[PDB]
Design a protein around this ligand. Structure first.
Ligand SMILES: OCCSc1ccc(Cl)cn1
Ligand SMILES: OCCSc1ccc(Cl)cn1
Ligand SMILES: OCCSc1ccc(Cl)cn1
Ligand SMILES: OCCSc1ccc(Cl)cn1
Ligand SMILES: OCCSc1ccc(Cl)cn1
Ligand SMILES: OCCSc1ccc(Cl)cn1
Lengths: 541, 541
C-alpha cells in the first residue's frame, strides 16, 4: 500500500524537457541527428556531464567542456553558442501545472512527496529564473533531492537507497515518476511502483489507477494558503505603547494588506503566496487591536487620524518611501484615507467591498448610520462592553456564525439593537461554513484570546472624530492609481454604495465578483487573486 | 535660553527653493518679470494657492487653477506647462546637507527640532520623489508640521501658537529659520529668535552665535545609526525549534546582512539606514545563536551546511527568490558558502575581512588552525564550557575588551591557550573604545543575557564537519558578482589572507580600508557605506 510519490523535475514537473531542446536545435540547424545529444552524454560516468550532475564542477565551468565535446562529435555553424541554447531552453521551461496539482492532491491525502532530480550548480548570470522555479516548486513538497547536492546521480543505485532513507519508507510504499526509462529501472528493480512519463494525461491516468485517488478531471483547486508557523513574522514599534505585527513574503514593490473587522493578517492567507509569486513584497498586517499587534483600551487610539499616522510611521521605520495599500472592510476605509491624506506614501490604492464615501458636513455621522437599516449592528457596537461580552462569550461560535458564504448565513444585521444582540437568533453550535476548516476557525479563536474584541470594536467608536477629520478632505480628489472591488452578495457593503466613486476618483478602475459575500478573500480567493494581480501589474509597477 | 530650533523646508532644508524656479522660468522664456510669481500668489488668502497650502484642495486640482491665474496675469508660449515646470522644480530640489547637519548637531546637544512648512497634498503621478525626500528629512526631527495637514498657513499667527504648543516651549526658548521675511515676522513679533536664510553659511554663522554651539567647520559626522525600538522587527520559523530574527528597513532589492562573532544585527547599525536610503530592502539578521534568534545547545546545529540550509528556508518563507548576501567575520564565511552551494538564491555576494579560502583536502582543519599563530584563540574556543565561562563572567568587560580600534587593543590572540584565557592580561574595568558609547555596549550586554556564548561559540566547533562539506565544492568557481573588502589593521583576518581569491572568483571586485581594525562596520562606517553602495549600484541591480 502506497504512501509516498516521487517526481522527476525535467520532463515531469517542468516542461518542455531540456533534452527536447538538444534535439530541436539539431533539427532547426540541419545538424546530424543526435550530434548535440551525444556530446551532452560523452564519457558517461567519467564525462563532464556526470561531474556537473554530481556537483564536482559548476554549470559555467561545464559550458566550455560541452563546447569541446560537440566539436569532437562533429561542421558546426558561425555564431553557435551552447550558452545561448541552454539559456533559451532553461528560460522556456515552466512548471507542468497539472503534474504539480496531482502531487498537491496526493500530499493533501496523506502522501509524503519528493522531487528527485539530476541537476547542476547554476552560476550563470541568468540563474535567478531557475532559482525562482525551484523556490516555487520545492515548497509544495516534503523533500527536494538534487544530484549536485548529494554527490550521487540517477541511475546509480545509491541515490535510490538515499531516496528510501529520506522517505523512511519501504520501496513497495513508493510511486516513482520519470521521463527516462533508464532512471526508472533501478526504482522498478528495487520494487517501487514506476510510471514512465511521456504525455502528462496518460501518466496521471496511470498514477490515479495505482494510488486509487482521483487526480484527473478534479474540480478547480483553491489557491495556495499559509501555514502561520512557516512565515516570516515582523514587528515594528510605532510608538511607546504600540507595536504592529505583520507577516512578510516575496520581493518586489511593497504591498500592504489591511484586513477588516473582526479579522487577522490570516484573512489574506490565499492572497499572500499568490501576490509574492506575482512579483510583489507582501506585508499582511495584524491591524491595531488585533492578533500580535498592540491593543490599547482607549477609544481615541482607534480613530482614522491615528491609525493612518501609525501606518505612515510603520513605513518610516521599515524604510519604505511607499507601499501599495489594499484593504477590506474597515481596512478598505483606512486605505482610502491613506490615499487622501498621504498620497506620497501610497503607490496605488485598492479596496475590497468598502466604497469611498465623502463625509456629509450637513449630517451627523450617527444620523447617517441610522438612515441605513443594514448598519444597525454598528449602533449595537457603540456602547462600551455590550458587544465585547457577546462576542467574547464563545469565540468558536462568534467566528462560525460570522464567517459564512451568502447561501449559508445565520445573521441579519438590521434590527440587532431591538433583538438585543448579534447572535440572539443564532444556534449555540453553528455548522462549519464551506469557506473554512475547523483548524482555520481555531486560529482566529487563539488570536482573539490575547486581546479580545475591545480594540477591534473601538474602530467603530470614533464616528464623530473620523467625520470631523474627513471633512478636511472635502475639496480633494483621489488622483493616484485606484481599484474598487465590489462583491455581488455583500448585504451590508452593497455594490450600489460605490456608484458615485468616480466623482472623487475620476480614473478609478473596477473589479466585480459575482456570488461573493462579505468575506471576499476566502469566499472567492481565485478571482480576488486574478483581479488584484492584473491591476497590480498594469497600475502599480 | 534656547532649547528648540525650527526650520522651514523650501529654501532652508531643501534647495534650490521652488520660488527660485518661477523666476528662472520667466528669465529663460523672456516673460515679463514676476508674471509667473504674481500668478502663484493671486487672490492672497482667498486665492487658489492658500486653499492648496491649507489642504482644501490637492496639487492636481490646483494645477489648472494656477494655469488660469497665469493667463489673466498676461502673451504665453506654444507648449507652456505649469505641470512640467513644477515637476522639474520639485525633482531638482534636494536636501541642504549642511543645514540638516546643523539640525542634527542641535538635536544631539539636547534641542527639540522641528520642520514648519507651507506645503501641499501631492497627488501627481510623480509624487514619490517628494514622498521620499520628506520620509528621509522627517526622521531626523522631533516634529513635522505641514500647513496642508494642520489647515493653517504661514504667516497667520495661529500656526505659530500651534508651533509653540507642539514644542511645549515659550517663544524665547525657540530659534526660527526661514527664507521669507514675511513668514519670519510673526515668530519675531512673538519673541522668538529669528534668522533670515539667504546663503546657508551666513545663516549657520547666525545660528552658531545665537545657540553657542559649533555647527560650521565641524569634524565629519558619523552615518545615521539605528534606535532598536524604532525598527521593524521580523521573525521567521525555519524549523520547529528554530526561529530567526531580523531588523528590516527600506524598499528595493533584498540585502541580507550577516554579522560575525560575538555580534548582533546591531553591528550593522551604521549600514542599515545608509543602504535603505540608497534604494535597498535591508534584512539585518540576528544569526542563529544570537539575540532574539533561537540558540539550540547542540554543536552540530551550527555547522555551515545547516546554517546555510536555514538561510535558504529563511528566503523561502519570506517569499524571496534571491537576496544579496553581505557578511562580516563568521557571516563572511557563511556568505561565501551561500554563493558556492546556492548561487541561484544569491543575487551578489560581499565579505568584509573574511576571505574565501578553499578547504585543504590533504590537511586536517585543526592542523591548518594550528599552523597560524593568530588563530590560537579558536583552539581555546573548542572545549565546551571553558570560553562560555570566561565570556559570560562579566558581559560589559567582554564587549569593552573586544570592541576596540587598532590603536586601542588590550587583546593579543596568539598564546591564549598557554595564557589560560582571552582576558587574563586584560583589565577588570576596560576603558570605553572611541567606536562605542556606554549605551551601545549595554545593548550587546542585554542581548547576550538571553542565550549567552554557547550557540555563538558552537560556530567554531564544527571545523571537521565544515571541512568535509567544503571539500564537495573544490571543483567549483564563484562566478556570480562578488566583492572582497579588506581591513588594513585586522590582525587576524589580514588582507594578505585574500591574495589568492581570484583563482576561485576570477571576476572578483575589491575594496580596501586603511587604518581599519577587525570591527569594520563601527570602525570605518562612512567608508564601508561608500564601498558597499557603490558596488551594489554597479553589480547588484
Ligand atoms: O463592519 C464594518 C463595515 S466597513 C465600515 C467602514 C466605514 C464605516 Cl464608517 C463603517 N463601516
Ligand atoms: O456572512 C455575511 C454576513 S456577516 C457580515 C459582517 C459584516 C459585514 Cl460589513 C457584512 N456581513
Ligand atoms: O464620515 C465619513 C465616513 S462615511 C462612510 C464611508 C464608507 C462606509 Cl462603508 C460607511 N460610511
Ligand atoms: O573569529 C572568527 C574569525 S572568521 C573565521 C572564519 C572561518 C573560520 Cl574556519 C574561522 N574563523
Ligand atoms: O580589537 C581587535 C582585536 S579583537 C579580534 C577578534 C576577532 C578577530 Cl577575527 C580579530 N580581532
Ligand atoms: O575548511 C575550510 C575553511 S578554511 C578558512 C577560510 C577562511 C578563514 Cl578566515 C579561515 N579558514
Amino acid at each position: 500500500t502506497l504512501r509516498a510519490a516521487v517526481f522527476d523535475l525535467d520532463g515531469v514537473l517542468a516542461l518542455p524537457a531540456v533534452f527536447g531542446v538538444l534535439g530541436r536545435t539539431e533539427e532547426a540547424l540541419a545538424l546530424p541527428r543526435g550530434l548535440l545529444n551525444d556530446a551532452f552524454q560523452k564519457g558517461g560516468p567519467e564525462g563532464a556531464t556526470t561531474r556537473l550532475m554530481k556537483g564536482e564542477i559548476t554549470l559555467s565551468q561545464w559550458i566550455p567542456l560541452m563546447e569541446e565535446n560537440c566539436r569532437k562529435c562533429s561542421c558546426l555553424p558561425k555564431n553557435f553558442s551552447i550558452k545561448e541554447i541552454f539559456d533559451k531552453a532553461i528560460s522556456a521551461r515552466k512548471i507542468n501545472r497539472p503534474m504539480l496539482q496531482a502531487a498537491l492532491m496526493l500530499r493533501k491525502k496523506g502522501f509524503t512527496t519528493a522531487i528527485l532530480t539530476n541537476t547542476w550548480l547554476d552560476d550563470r548570470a541568468e540563474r535567478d529564473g531557475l532559482a525562482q522555479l525551484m523556490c516555487e516548486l520545492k515548497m509544495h513538497f516534503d523533500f527536494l533531492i538534487e544530484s549536485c547536492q548529494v554527490g550521487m546521480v540517477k541511475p546509480e543505485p545509491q541515490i535510490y537507497k538515499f531516496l528510501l532513507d529520506t522517505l523512511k519508507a519501504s520501496p513497495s510504499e513508493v510511486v516513482f515518476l520519470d521521463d527516462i526509462g533508464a532512471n526508472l529501472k533501478p526504482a522498478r528493480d528495487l520494487g517501487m511502483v514506476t510510471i514512465l512519463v511521456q504525455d502528462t494525461d496518460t501518466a496521471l491516468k496511470e498514477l490515479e489507477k495505482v494510488t486509487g485517488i482521483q487526480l484527473l478531471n478534479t474540480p478547480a483547486p483553491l489557491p495556495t494558503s499559509c501555514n502561520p508557523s512557516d512565515m516570516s513574522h515582523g514587528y515594528v514599534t510605532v510608538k511607546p505603547r504600540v507595536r504592529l505585527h505583520f507577516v512578510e513574503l516575496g520581493s518586489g514593490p511593497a504591498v500592504c494588506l489591511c484586513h477588516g473587522f473582526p479579522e487577522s493578517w490570516y484573512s489574506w492567507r490565499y492572497q499572500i503566496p499568490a501576490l509574492a509569486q506575482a512579483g510583489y513584497r507582501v506585508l499582511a498586517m495584524d491591524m491595531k487591536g488585533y492578533g500580535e499587534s498592540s491593543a490599547p483600551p482607549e477609544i481615541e487610539e482607534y480613530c482614522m487620524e491615528v491609525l493612518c499616522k501609525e501606518m505612515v510611521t510603520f513605513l518610516d521605520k521599515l524604510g519604505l518611501s511607499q507601499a501599495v495599500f489594499i484593504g477590506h472592510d474597515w481596512g478598505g476605509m483606512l486605505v482610502w484615507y491613506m490615499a487622501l491624506f498621504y498620497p506620497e506614501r501610497v503607490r496605488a490604492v485598492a479596496s475590497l467591498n468598502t466604497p469611498f464615501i465623502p463625509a456629509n458636513p450637513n449630517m451627523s455621522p450617527l444620523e447617517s448610520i441610522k438612515a441605513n437599516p443594514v448598519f444597525d449592528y454598528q449602533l449595537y457596537f457603540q456602547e462600551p462592553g455590550v458587544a465585547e461580552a457577546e462576542l467574547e462569550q464563545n469565540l468558536s461560535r462568534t467566528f462560525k456564525s460570522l464567517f459564512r458564504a451568502s447561501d449559508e448565513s445565520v445573521l441579519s444585521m438590521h434590527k440587532v439593537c431591538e433583538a438585543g444582540g448579534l447572535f440572539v437568533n443564532s444556534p449555540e453550535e453553528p455548522s462549519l461554513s464551506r469557506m473554512v476548516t475547523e483548524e482555520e476557525i481555531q486560529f482566529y479563536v487563539q488570536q482573539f484570546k490575547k486581546s479580545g474584541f475591545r480594540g477591534p470594536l473601538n474602530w467603530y467608536r470614533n464616528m464623530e472624530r473620523n467625520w470631523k477629520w474627513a471633512c478636511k478632505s472635502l475639496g480633494r480628489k483621489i488622483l493616484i492609481p485606484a481599484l474598487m472591488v465590489t462583491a455581488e452578495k455583500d448585504f451590508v457593503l452593497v455594490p450600489q454604495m460605490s456608484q458615485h466613486m468616480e466623482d472623487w476618483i475620476p480614473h478609478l478602475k473596477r473589479g466585480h465578483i459575482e456570488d461573493c459575500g462579505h468575506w471576499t478573500q476566502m469566499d472567492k480567493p481565485t478571482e480576488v487573486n486574478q483581479i488584484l494581480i492584473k491591476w497590480l501589474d498594469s497600475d502599480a509597477r
